[PDB]
């Protein structure tokens, strides 16, 4: 499944792609912890439910940092 594994001091950027029933789209950016950034994106989507209907989301990571530590 789509599991978010929280890290302390995490800072991520979320690019939300809003796709409407008629094929038109809208994009917006959100920043902060994953929890904070996604909740703002979902709150935003909820403000559009009135005129655009129910929505579903797919979370797709695009960039990562790998911290590789050598013991010596
Ligand atoms: Zn986990
Ligand atoms: Zn998190
Ligand atoms: Zn997915």
| DSSP string for 30-50 | EEESHHHHHHHHHHHHHHHHH
* Residue 35 CA to ligand 2 centre (angstroms): 5
Residue 72 CA, ligand 3 centroid: distance in Å: 38
CATH topology of domain 1-72: Ubiquitin-like (UB roll) (3.10.20)
What is the 8-class DSSP label of residue 71? -
- At residue 50, what are phi and psi to the nearest 5 degrees? -55, -45
Q: What is the dihedral of CA 32, 35, 40, 43, to 10 degrees?
A: 180
Ligand with minimal distance to 32 CA:
2
Ligand 2 geometric centre to CA of 39 (Å): 11
Those residues whose beta carbon sits under 5 angstroms from the ion ligand 3 are 58
Buried b or exposed e, range 41-65, using 16+ CB within 10 angstroms = beeebeeeeeeeeeeeeeeeeeeee
- Resolution in Å equals 1.9
Method: X-ray
CA distances from 39 to 28, 43, 44, 71 (A): 13, 6, 8, 38
Compute the radius of gyration of the chain from its Cα atoms: 16
């Amino acid at each position: 499944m789509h599991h978010h594994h929280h890290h302390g001091m995490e800072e991520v950027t979320i690019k939300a792609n809003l796709i409407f029933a008629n094929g038109s789209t809208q994009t917006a950016e959100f920043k902060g912890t994953f929890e904070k950034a996604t909740s703002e994106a979902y709150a935003y989507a909820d403000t559009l439910k009135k005129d655009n209907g129910e929505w579903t989301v797919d979370v797709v990571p695009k960039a990562y940092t790998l911290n590789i530590k050598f013991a010596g």
